[PDB]
Amino acid sequence: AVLGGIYEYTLVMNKEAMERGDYTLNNVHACAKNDFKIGGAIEEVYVSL
Amino acid sequence: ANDLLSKVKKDKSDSFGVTIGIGPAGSPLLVGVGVSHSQDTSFLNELNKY
């Protein structure tokens, strides 16, 4: 028989990572314009609107 | 660790006006018409979670 003994050691490591990203944008512009003018003159009646 | 965020804003604007002028002459006459309108809308919403 041999007299040696036992000496041991161990180590374990772990790591995890995660990232999430979400972005959105919406922009709508609406513009409407009109111009209407009428003219009437006779001689006697005058019409305008 | 978790993070949640949401911030939204809404804006709306509208305006219109009508003007009418009618007058017969020949006995001069005058008629005036004025119309005005304006509309504004604003919305704000913000959410945050951790």
mmCIF file of N, CA and C in Angstrom:
data_model
loop_
_atom_site.group_PDB
_atom_site.id
_atom_site.type_symbol
_atom_site.label_atom_id
_atom_site.label_comp_id
_atom_site.label_asym_id
_atom_site.label_seq_id
_atom_site.Cartn_x
_atom_site.Cartn_y
_atom_site.Cartn_z
ATOM 1 N N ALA A 1 0.838 -1.189 0.000
ATOM 2 C CA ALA A 1 0.000 0.000 0.000
ATOM 3 C C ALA A 1 0.876 1.242 0.000
ATOM 4 N N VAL A 2 0.384 2.287 -0.659
ATOM 5 C CA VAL A 2 1.063 3.574 -0.742
ATOM 6 C C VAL A 2 0.233 4.602 0.015
ATOM 7 N N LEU A 3 0.910 5.475 0.754
ATOM 8 C CA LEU A 3 0.265 6.473 1.606
ATOM 9 C C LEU A 3 0.435 7.835 0.936
ATOM 10 N N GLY A 4 -0.569 8.237 0.159
ATOM 11 C CA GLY A 4 -0.472 9.462 -0.610
ATOM 12 C C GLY A 4 -1.473 10.545 -0.264
ATOM 13 N N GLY A 5 -2.672 10.156 0.166
ATOM 14 C CA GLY A 5 -3.724 11.122 0.418
ATOM 15 C C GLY A 5 -4.300 11.705 -0.858
ATOM 16 N N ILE A 6 -5.365 12.497 -0.737
ATOM 17 C CA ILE A 6 -6.036 13.088 -1.890
ATOM 18 C C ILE A 6 -6.342 14.547 -1.587
ATOM 19 N N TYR A 7 -5.930 15.436 -2.491
ATOM 20 C CA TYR A 7 -6.226 16.861 -2.402
ATOM 21 C C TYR A 7 -6.746 17.315 -3.757
ATOM 22 N N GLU A 8 -7.954 17.876 -3.777
ATOM 23 C CA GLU A 8 -8.610 18.222 -5.029
ATOM 24 C C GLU A 8 -9.325 19.560 -4.892
ATOM 25 N N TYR A 9 -9.673 20.132 -6.042
ATOM 26 C CA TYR A 9 -10.377 21.405 -6.109
ATOM 27 C C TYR A 9 -10.992 21.550 -7.493
ATOM 28 N N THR A 10 -12.165 22.179 -7.552
ATOM 29 C CA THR A 10 -12.851 22.401 -8.816
ATOM 30 C C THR A 10 -13.640 23.701 -8.733
ATOM 31 N N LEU A 11 -13.904 24.289 -9.899
ATOM 32 C CA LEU A 11 -14.641 25.540 -9.981
ATOM 33 C C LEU A 11 -15.397 25.591 -11.300
ATOM 34 N N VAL A 12 -16.627 26.096 -11.250
ATOM 35 C CA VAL A 12 -17.481 26.221 -12.424
ATOM 36 C C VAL A 12 -18.087 27.617 -12.439
ATOM 37 N N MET A 13 -18.157 28.215 -13.627
ATOM 38 C CA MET A 13 -18.696 29.557 -13.788
ATOM 39 C C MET A 13 -19.617 29.595 -14.999
ATOM 40 N N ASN A 14 -20.669 30.407 -14.897
ATOM 41 C CA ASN A 14 -21.625 30.584 -15.979
ATOM 42 C C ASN A 14 -21.981 32.059 -16.094
ATOM 43 N N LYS A 15 -22.504 32.434 -17.261
ATOM 44 C CA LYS A 15 -22.875 33.819 -17.518
ATOM 45 C C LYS A 15 -23.845 33.866 -18.689
ATOM 46 N N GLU A 16 -24.838 34.749 -18.589
ATOM 47 C CA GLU A 16 -25.825 34.946 -19.640
ATOM 48 C C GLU A 16 -26.157 36.427 -19.742
ATOM 49 N N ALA A 17 -26.555 36.851 -20.940
ATOM 50 C CA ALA A 17 -26.895 38.244 -21.183
ATOM 51 C C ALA A 17 -27.920 38.324 -22.304
ATOM 52 N N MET A 18 -28.762 39.354 -22.242
ATOM 53 C CA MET A 18 -29.788 39.570 -23.251
ATOM 54 C C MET A 18 -30.173 41.042 -23.266
ATOM 55 N N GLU A 19 -30.557 41.527 -24.447
ATOM 56 C CA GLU A 19 -30.985 42.906 -24.620
ATOM 57 C C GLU A 19 -32.152 42.946 -25.597
ATOM 58 N N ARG A 20 -33.061 43.892 -25.372
ATOM 59 C CA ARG A 20 -34.233 44.071 -26.218
ATOM 60 C C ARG A 20 -34.401 45.547 -26.548
ATOM 61 N N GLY A 21 -34.730 45.831 -27.805
ATOM 62 C CA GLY A 21 -34.939 47.195 -28.246
ATOM 63 C C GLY A 21 -36.090 47.329 -29.222
ATOM 64 N N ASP A 22 -36.990 48.277 -28.961
ATOM 65 C CA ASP A 22 -38.153 48.499 -29.809
ATOM 66 C C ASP A 22 -38.411 49.994 -29.915
ATOM 67 N N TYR A 23 -38.605 50.475 -31.140
ATOM 68 C CA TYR A 23 -38.862 51.888 -31.378
ATOM 69 C C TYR A 23 -39.783 52.029 -32.579
ATOM 70 N N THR A 24 -40.649 53.039 -32.536
ATOM 71 C CA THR A 24 -41.561 53.318 -33.635
ATOM 72 C C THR A 24 -41.965 54.784 -33.584
ATOM 73 N N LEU A 25 -42.269 55.339 -34.756
ATOM 74 C CA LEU A 25 -42.672 56.733 -34.865
ATOM 75 C C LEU A 25 -43.609 56.883 -36.053
ATOM 76 N N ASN A 26 -44.622 57.735 -35.897
ATOM 77 C CA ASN A 26 -45.569 58.026 -36.964
ATOM 78 C C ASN A 26 -45.942 59.499 -36.905
ATOM 79 N N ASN A 27 -45.901 60.166 -38.056
ATOM 80 C CA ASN A 27 -46.233 61.584 -38.139
ATOM 81 C C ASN A 27 -46.900 61.842 -39.479
ATOM 82 N N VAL A 28 -48.116 62.386 -39.447
ATOM 83 C CA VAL A 28 -48.887 62.683 -40.648
ATOM 84 C C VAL A 28 -49.446 64.093 -40.522
ATOM 85 N N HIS A 29 -49.312 64.880 -41.589
ATOM 86 C CA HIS A 29 -49.799 66.252 -41.628
ATOM 87 C C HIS A 29 -50.707 66.430 -42.835
ATOM 88 N N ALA A 30 -51.839 67.101 -42.624
ATOM 89 C CA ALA A 30 -52.824 67.330 -43.672
ATOM 90 C C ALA A 30 -53.229 68.795 -43.674
ATOM 91 N N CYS A 31 -53.269 69.394 -44.862
ATOM 92 C CA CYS A 31 -53.654 70.790 -45.020
ATOM 93 C C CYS A 31 -54.435 70.948 -46.316
ATOM 94 N N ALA A 32 -55.589 71.606 -46.234
ATOM 95 C CA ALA A 32 -56.439 71.842 -47.392
ATOM 96 C C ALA A 32 -57.007 73.250 -47.322
ATOM 97 N N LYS A 33 -56.969 73.954 -48.452
ATOM 98 C CA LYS A 33 -57.463 75.321 -48.533
ATOM 99 C C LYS A 33 -58.103 75.539 -49.896
ATOM 100 N N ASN A 34 -59.195 76.302 -49.917
ATOM 101 C CA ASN A 34 -59.869 76.646 -51.159
ATOM 102 C C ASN A 34 -60.264 78.116 -51.134
ATOM 103 N N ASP A 35 -60.475 78.670 -52.326
ATOM 104 C CA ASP A 35 -60.896 80.056 -52.483
ATOM 105 C C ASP A 35 -61.868 80.145 -53.648
ATOM 106 N N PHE A 36 -63.063 80.673 -53.382
ATOM 107 C CA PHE A 36 -64.093 80.813 -54.404
ATOM 108 C C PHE A 36 -64.751 82.175 -54.264
ATOM 109 N N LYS A 37 -64.771 82.935 -55.357
ATOM 110 C CA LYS A 37 -65.382 84.257 -55.383
ATOM 111 C C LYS A 37 -66.065 84.455 -56.727
ATOM 112 N N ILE A 38 -67.285 84.987 -56.698
ATOM 113 C CA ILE A 38 -68.053 85.241 -57.910
ATOM 114 C C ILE A 38 -68.377 86.726 -57.981
ATOM 115 N N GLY A 39 -68.571 87.215 -59.202
ATOM 116 C CA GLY A 39 -68.883 88.615 -59.413
ATOM 117 C C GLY A 39 -69.854 88.849 -60.551
ATOM 118 N N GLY A 40 -70.920 89.600 -60.282
ATOM 119 C CA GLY A 40 -71.904 89.907 -61.300
ATOM 120 C C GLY A 40 -72.473 91.304 -61.167
ATOM 121 N N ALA A 41 -72.448 92.068 -62.257
ATOM 122 C CA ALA A 41 -72.963 93.431 -62.262
ATOM 123 C C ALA A 41 -73.628 93.712 -63.598
ATOM 124 N N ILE A 42 -74.851 94.232 -63.550
ATOM 125 C CA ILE A 42 -75.609 94.578 -64.747
ATOM 126 C C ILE A 42 -76.370 95.868 -64.474
ATOM 127 N N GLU A 43 -76.503 96.701 -65.502
ATOM 128 C CA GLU A 43 -77.210 97.970 -65.369
ATOM 129 C C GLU A 43 -77.907 98.345 -66.674
ATOM 130 N N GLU A 44 -80.910 97.646 -62.531
ATOM 131 C CA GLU A 44 -79.542 97.388 -62.092
ATOM 132 C C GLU A 44 -79.521 96.333 -60.987
ATOM 133 N N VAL A 45 -78.700 95.301 -61.174
ATOM 134 C CA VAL A 45 -78.581 94.200 -60.221
ATOM 135 C C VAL A 45 -77.104 93.876 -60.046
ATOM 136 N N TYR A 46 -76.669 93.746 -58.794
ATOM 137 C CA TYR A 46 -75.294 93.392 -58.465
ATOM 138 C C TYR A 46 -75.292 92.091 -57.676
ATOM 139 N N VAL A 47 -74.434 91.155 -58.080
ATOM 140 C CA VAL A 47 -74.356 89.833 -57.469
ATOM 141 C C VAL A 47 -72.901 89.532 -57.143
ATOM 142 N N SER A 48 -72.635 89.179 -55.887
ATOM 143 C CA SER A 48 -71.296 88.821 -55.444
ATOM 144 C C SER A 48 -71.409 87.861 -54.270
ATOM 145 N N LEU A 49 -70.550 86.844 -54.256
ATOM 146 C CA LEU A 49 -70.563 85.844 -53.197
ATOM 147 C C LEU A 49 -69.192 85.192 -53.109
ATOM 148 N N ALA B 1 -33.230 41.512 -14.632
ATOM 149 C CA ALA B 1 -33.719 42.882 -14.675
ATOM 150 C C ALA B 1 -34.486 43.102 -15.970
ATOM 151 N N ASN B 2 -35.623 43.785 -15.867
ATOM 152 C CA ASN B 2 -36.464 44.073 -17.019
ATOM 153 C C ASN B 2 -36.944 45.513 -16.942
ATOM 154 N N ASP B 3 -36.996 46.176 -18.096
ATOM 155 C CA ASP B 3 -37.429 47.563 -18.187
ATOM 156 C C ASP B 3 -38.419 47.702 -19.332
ATOM 157 N N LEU B 4 -39.512 48.422 -19.082
ATOM 158 C CA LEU B 4 -40.546 48.663 -20.079
ATOM 159 C C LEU B 4 -40.933 50.132 -20.039
ATOM 160 N N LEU B 5 -40.982 50.766 -21.208
ATOM 161 C CA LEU B 5 -41.296 52.184 -21.308
ATOM 162 C C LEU B 5 -42.105 52.432 -22.572
ATOM 163 N N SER B 6 -43.051 53.366 -22.484
ATOM 164 C CA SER B 6 -43.879 53.733 -23.631
ATOM 165 C C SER B 6 -44.474 55.108 -23.370
ATOM 166 N N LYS B 7 -44.109 56.086 -24.196
ATOM 167 C CA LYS B 7 -44.602 57.453 -24.069
ATOM 168 C C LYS B 7 -45.011 57.954 -25.444
ATOM 169 N N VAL B 8 -46.301 58.239 -25.613
ATOM 170 C CA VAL B 8 -46.856 58.661 -26.893
ATOM 171 C C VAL B 8 -47.634 59.957 -26.692
ATOM 172 N N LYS B 9 -47.534 60.858 -27.666
ATOM 173 C CA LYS B 9 -48.236 62.134 -27.638
ATOM 174 C C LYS B 9 -48.913 62.368 -28.980
ATOM 175 N N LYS B 10 -50.139 62.884 -28.935
ATOM 176 C CA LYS B 10 -50.932 63.135 -30.132
ATOM 177 C C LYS B 10 -51.463 64.560 -30.093
ATOM 178 N N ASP B 11 -51.346 65.265 -31.218
ATOM 179 C CA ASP B 11 -51.814 66.638 -31.336
ATOM 180 C C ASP B 11 -52.564 66.806 -32.648
ATOM 181 N N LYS B 12 -53.691 67.514 -32.591
ATOM 182 C CA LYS B 12 -54.521 67.756 -33.763
ATOM 183 C C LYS B 12 -55.065 69.176 -33.709
ATOM 184 N N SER B 13 -55.138 69.821 -34.873
ATOM 185 C CA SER B 13 -55.612 71.194 -34.962
ATOM 186 C C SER B 13 -56.359 71.386 -36.273
ATOM 187 N N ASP B 14 -57.467 72.123 -36.211
ATOM 188 C CA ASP B 14 -58.281 72.398 -37.387
ATOM 189 C C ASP B 14 -58.985 73.734 -37.204
ATOM 190 N N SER B 15 -59.102 74.490 -38.295
ATOM 191 C CA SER B 15 -59.751 75.792 -38.252
ATOM 192 C C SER B 15 -60.254 76.143 -39.645
ATOM 193 N N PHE B 16 -61.465 76.694 -39.709
ATOM 194 C CA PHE B 16 -62.040 77.124 -40.975
ATOM 195 C C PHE B 16 -62.986 78.289 -40.732
ATOM 196 N N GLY B 17 -63.058 79.184 -41.715
ATOM 197 C CA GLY B 17 -63.925 80.341 -41.634
ATOM 198 C C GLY B 17 -64.485 80.755 -42.979
ATOM 199 N N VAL B 18 -65.763 81.124 -43.012
ATOM 200 C CA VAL B 18 -66.454 81.483 -44.243
ATOM 201 C C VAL B 18 -66.909 82.934 -44.144
ATOM 202 N N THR B 19 -66.717 83.684 -45.227
ATOM 203 C CA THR B 19 -67.164 85.068 -45.320
ATOM 204 C C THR B 19 -67.946 85.242 -46.613
ATOM 205 N N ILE B 20 -69.133 85.839 -46.511
ATOM 206 C CA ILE B 20 -70.019 86.039 -47.651
ATOM 207 C C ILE B 20 -70.525 87.472 -47.623
ATOM 208 N N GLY B 21 -70.461 88.148 -48.768
ATOM 209 C CA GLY B 21 -71.005 89.485 -48.888
ATOM 210 C C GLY B 21 -71.841 89.653 -50.138
ATOM 211 N N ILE B 22 -73.127 89.950 -49.963
ATOM 212 C CA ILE B 22 -74.073 90.080 -51.066
ATOM 213 C C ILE B 22 -74.770 91.426 -50.941
ATOM 214 N N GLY B 23 -74.862 92.157 -52.047
ATOM 215 C CA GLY B 23 -75.592 93.400 -52.054
ATOM 216 C C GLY B 23 -76.157 93.765 -53.410
ATOM 217 N N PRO B 24 -77.477 93.949 -53.473
ATOM 218 C CA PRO B 24 -78.098 94.485 -54.690
ATOM 219 C C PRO B 24 -78.132 96.005 -54.674
ATOM 220 N N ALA B 25 -77.899 96.593 -55.844
ATOM 221 C CA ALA B 25 -77.904 98.039 -55.996
ATOM 222 C C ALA B 25 -78.609 98.409 -57.291
ATOM 223 N N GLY B 26 -79.456 99.432 -57.225
ATOM 224 C CA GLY B 26 -80.190 99.890 -58.389
ATOM 225 C C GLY B 26 -81.683 100.010 -58.154
ATOM 226 N N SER B 27 -81.740 101.552 -55.381
ATOM 227 C CA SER B 27 -81.890 101.037 -54.024
ATOM 228 C C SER B 27 -80.689 100.187 -53.621
ATOM 229 N N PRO B 28 -79.612 100.839 -53.182
ATOM 230 C CA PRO B 28 -78.429 100.090 -52.745
ATOM 231 C C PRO B 28 -78.713 99.295 -51.482
ATOM 232 N N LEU B 29 -78.183 98.074 -51.440
ATOM 233 C CA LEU B 29 -78.371 97.182 -50.308
ATOM 234 C C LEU B 29 -77.060 96.464 -50.022
ATOM 235 N N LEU B 30 -76.881 96.058 -48.767
ATOM 236 C CA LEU B 30 -75.671 95.373 -48.339
ATOM 237 C C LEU B 30 -76.024 94.297 -47.323
ATOM 238 N N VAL B 31 -75.415 93.122 -47.481
ATOM 239 C CA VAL B 31 -75.563 92.014 -46.545
ATOM 240 C C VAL B 31 -74.182 91.433 -46.279
ATOM 241 N N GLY B 32 -73.845 91.268 -45.009
ATOM 242 C CA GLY B 32 -72.563 90.707 -44.610
ATOM 243 C C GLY B 32 -72.760 89.426 -43.823
ATOM 244 N N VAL B 33 -71.902 88.443 -44.088
ATOM 245 C CA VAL B 33 -71.950 87.146 -43.422
ATOM 246 C C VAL B 33 -70.541 86.781 -42.981
ATOM 247 N N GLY B 34 -70.394 86.421 -41.709
ATOM 248 C CA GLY B 34 -69.109 86.014 -41.180
ATOM 249 C C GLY B 34 -69.189 84.730 -40.383
ATOM 250 N N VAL B 35 -68.302 83.784 -40.679
ATOM 251 C CA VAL B 35 -68.263 82.491 -40.007
ATOM 252 C C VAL B 35 -66.828 82.210 -39.585
ATOM 253 N N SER B 36 -66.662 81.709 -38.364
ATOM 254 C CA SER B 36 -65.353 81.343 -37.842
ATOM 255 C C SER B 36 -65.474 80.047 -37.059
ATOM 256 N N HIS B 37 -64.457 79.195 -37.171
ATOM 257 C CA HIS B 37 -64.431 77.921 -36.468
ATOM 258 C C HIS B 37 -62.986 77.499 -36.246
ATOM 259 N N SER B 38 -62.725 76.906 -35.083
ATOM 260 C CA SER B 38 -61.397 76.413 -34.746
ATOM 261 C C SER B 38 -61.532 75.209 -33.826
ATOM 262 N N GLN B 39 -60.732 74.177 -34.092
ATOM 263 C CA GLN B 39 -60.742 72.949 -33.307
ATOM 264 C C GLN B 39 -59.311 72.524 -33.020
ATOM 265 N N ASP B 40 -59.036 72.176 -31.765
ATOM 266 C CA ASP B 40 -57.722 71.705 -31.351
ATOM 267 C C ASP B 40 -57.888 70.471 -30.478
ATOM 268 N N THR B 41 -57.028 69.478 -30.698
ATOM 269 C CA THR B 41 -57.075 68.230 -29.945
ATOM 270 C C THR B 41 -55.660 67.828 -29.561
ATOM 271 N N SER B 42 -55.464 67.500 -28.284
ATOM 272 C CA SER B 42 -54.168 67.088 -27.768
ATOM 273 C C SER B 42 -54.340 65.862 -26.886
ATOM 274 N N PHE B 43 -53.444 64.889 -27.057
ATOM 275 C CA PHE B 43 -53.477 63.655 -26.288
ATOM 276 C C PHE B 43 -52.065 63.290 -25.859
ATOM 277 N N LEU B 44 -51.924 62.876 -24.601
ATOM 278 C CA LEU B 44 -50.633 62.493 -24.046
ATOM 279 C C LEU B 44 -50.799 61.229 -23.220
ATOM 280 N N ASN B 45 -49.910 60.261 -23.432
ATOM 281 C CA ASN B 45 -49.929 59.007 -22.692
ATOM 282 C C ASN B 45 -48.502 58.530 -22.486
ATOM 283 N N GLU B 46 -48.175 58.158 -21.250
ATOM 284 C CA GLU B 46 -46.839 57.686 -20.910
ATOM 285 C C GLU B 46 -46.949 56.507 -19.957
ATOM 286 N N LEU B 47 -46.204 55.443 -20.248
ATOM 287 C CA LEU B 47 -46.186 54.241 -19.428
ATOM 288 C C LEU B 47 -44.747 53.795 -19.217
ATOM 289 N N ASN B 48 -44.427 53.409 -17.984
ATOM 290 C CA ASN B 48 -43.086 52.966 -17.632
ATOM 291 C C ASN B 48 -43.189 51.838 -16.617
ATOM 292 N N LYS B 49 -42.480 50.740 -16.878
ATOM 293 C CA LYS B 49 -42.487 49.581 -16.000
ATOM 294 C C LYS B 49 -41.066 49.063 -15.834
ATOM 295 N N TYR B 50 -40.715 48.703 -14.602
ATOM 296 C CA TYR B 50 -39.394 48.176 -14.283
ATOM 297 C C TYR B 50 -39.547 46.965 -13.377
#
